[PDB]
Amino acid sequence: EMQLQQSGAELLRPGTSVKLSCKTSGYIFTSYWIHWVKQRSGQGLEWIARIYPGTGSTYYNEKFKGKATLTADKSSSTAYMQLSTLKSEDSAVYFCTRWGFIPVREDYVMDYWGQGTLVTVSSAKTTAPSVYPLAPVCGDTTGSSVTLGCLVKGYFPEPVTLTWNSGSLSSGVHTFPAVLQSDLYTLSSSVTVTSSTWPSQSITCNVAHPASSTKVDKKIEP
Amino acid sequence: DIVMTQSPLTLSVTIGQPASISCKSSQSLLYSNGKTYLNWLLQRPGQSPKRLIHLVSKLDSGVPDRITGSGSGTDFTLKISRVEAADLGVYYCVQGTHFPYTFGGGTKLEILRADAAPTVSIFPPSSEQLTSGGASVVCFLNNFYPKDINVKWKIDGSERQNGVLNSWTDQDSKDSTYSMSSTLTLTKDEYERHNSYTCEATHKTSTSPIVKSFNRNEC
Numbered sequence A: 001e002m003q004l005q006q007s008g009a010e011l012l013r014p015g016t017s018v019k020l021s022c023k024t025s026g027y028i029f030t031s032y033w034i035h036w037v038k039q040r041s042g043q044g045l046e047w048i049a050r051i052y053p054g055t056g057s058t059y060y061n062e063k064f065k066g067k068a069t070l071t072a073d074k075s076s077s078t079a080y081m082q083l084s085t086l087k088s089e090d091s092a093v094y095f096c097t098r099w100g101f102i103p104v105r106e107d108y109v110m111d112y113w114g115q116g117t118l119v120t121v122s123s124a125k126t127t128a129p130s131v132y133p134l135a136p137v138c139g140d141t142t143g144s145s146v147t148l149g150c151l152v153k154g155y156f157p158e159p160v161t162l163t164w165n166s167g168s169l170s171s172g173v174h175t176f177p178a179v180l181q182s183d184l185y186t187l188s189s190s191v192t193v194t195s196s197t198w199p200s201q202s203i204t205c206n207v208a209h210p211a212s213s214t215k216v217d218k219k220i221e222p
Numbered sequence B: 001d002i003v004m005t006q007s008p009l010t011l012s013v014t015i016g017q018p019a020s021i022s023c024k025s026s027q028s029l030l031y032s033n034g035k036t037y038l039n040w041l042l043q044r045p046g047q048s049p050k051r052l053i054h055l056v057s058k059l060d061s062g063v064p065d066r067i068t069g070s071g072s073g074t075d076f077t078l079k080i081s082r083v084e085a086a087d088l089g090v091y092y093c094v095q096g097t098h099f100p101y102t103f104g105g106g107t108k109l110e111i112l113r114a115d116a117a118p119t120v121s122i123f124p125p126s127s128e129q130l131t132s133g134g135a136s137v138v139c140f141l142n143n144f145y146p147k148d149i150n151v152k153w154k155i156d157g158s159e160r161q162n163g164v165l166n167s168w169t170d171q172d173s174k175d176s177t178y179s180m181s182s183t184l185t186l187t188k189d190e191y192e193r194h195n196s197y198t199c200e201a202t203h204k205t206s207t208s209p210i211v212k213s214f215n216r217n218e219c
């Protein structure tokens, strides 16, 4: 199993720098080129650079010379990308990939990608979210089924982790993308169950915000 | 740098039907060695990109042969002979003939399904929130299709435009529908001054607005 695992989300102050890591396993690290790709506002991909771990040989997209520096630790099968003097345009998701093009063969093997690392360039303070349970009254859909909710608001930065009944409840769950407004995010999730389950069986909203070490569980009481 | 132009930006196709996406380049992608380094990638919702085709028409291992690629020079096309639910996502063509490698803007493939009327739920502020001096009224509009919808909030008959936060999910892989959440936030004091809170939606599935409301009072 070829696996590329990238480091966690980063909140970075303007003008400073970060080092992102891409840990690989399952193949001979020194024999394949590792490329780094950038994605802004979803549809908006850009090729940054590539490195051949076996030799340390690198090639950069002109735009990123001076912005990105690629290195690779053979002893740990880990590739790194340092980004210097961060600015607004640097807030993006960065992917590492064992692309697979084999120059000598003029052909390709399978491409494997890391999960991506989100970088947020901001001077804003880390703020813990407030979690509110949404028991219906009108948003009960009447009989048959009922939908409950969970409102997570006033946090910074992304991400926040939301599950229902510790992940034991995933069917009929809709988690909405966070929206930033006034330097703080708001996220919400709904879960629809049968009139029979709730309130008979307890439904709990689990929320985690790594940045502020927050972890809360809100039970939806009638 | 080479500019890659993709069209259409979005395509809505029914399962079982064919789809074709175009990609045009500002310079010929034919390399001096006679090979053409044009690739096609698919980025599924919440996933990393994945390559489908390399060298214009060659399929990567494990990719269904329902997908085919063709073209040359500055003109290329990706074709899906018969669309399946798993094809939902954004497709990108990316050239590697000229340095630096450049991507097209992407084409979002949406699964066209039968209209579905929204299931709307409304929630008054939680006691916990009111304690903090804030008041948010939430409205969930779940599983509708088409994605086009307009929601307005009305308090005591008058439209409220300030303090509204909307969020939509991407198209669901399970049923091909969309969901939306609308949160209206006020101060606890103002919330306790009004009676009726209405979430009103405008959607293809109805000639009149879809309404959901509650009246706050005592007892």
Ligand SMILES: O=C(O)CCCCCNC(=O)CCCP(=O)(O)Oc1ccc([N+](=O)[O-])cc1
Pocket (backbone or CB within 6 Å): A035, A037, A047, A097, A099, A101, B037, B038, B039, B094, B095, B096, B097, B098, B099, B100, B101
């Ligand atoms: O035109 C010029 O100016 C000089 C041309 C020199 C370029 C040399 N070209 C090559 O070695 C071929 C590489 C083709 P490729 O498919 O690997 O390119 C890529 C590589 C990574 C990508 N990704 O998204 O990760 C996307 C495309």
Ligand SMILES: [Zn+2]
Pocket (backbone or CB within 6 Å): none
């Ligand atoms: Zn050949």
Ligand SMILES: [Zn+2]
Pocket (backbone or CB within 6 Å): A107, A108, B054, B058
């Ligand atoms: Zn091949």
Ligand SMILES: [Zn+2]
Pocket (backbone or CB within 6 Å): B097, B098, B099
């Ligand atoms: Zn060239």
Ligand SMILES: [Zn+2]
Pocket (backbone or CB within 6 Å): none
């Ligand atoms: Zn040339």
Ligand SMILES: [Zn+2]
Pocket (backbone or CB within 6 Å): B155, B156, B158
């Ligand atoms: Zn009034």
Ligand SMILES: [Zn+2]
Pocket (backbone or CB within 6 Å): B156
């Ligand atoms: Zn009045």
Ligand SMILES: [Zn+2]
Pocket (backbone or CB within 6 Å): B155, B156, B193, B194, B195
């Ligand atoms: Zn009023």
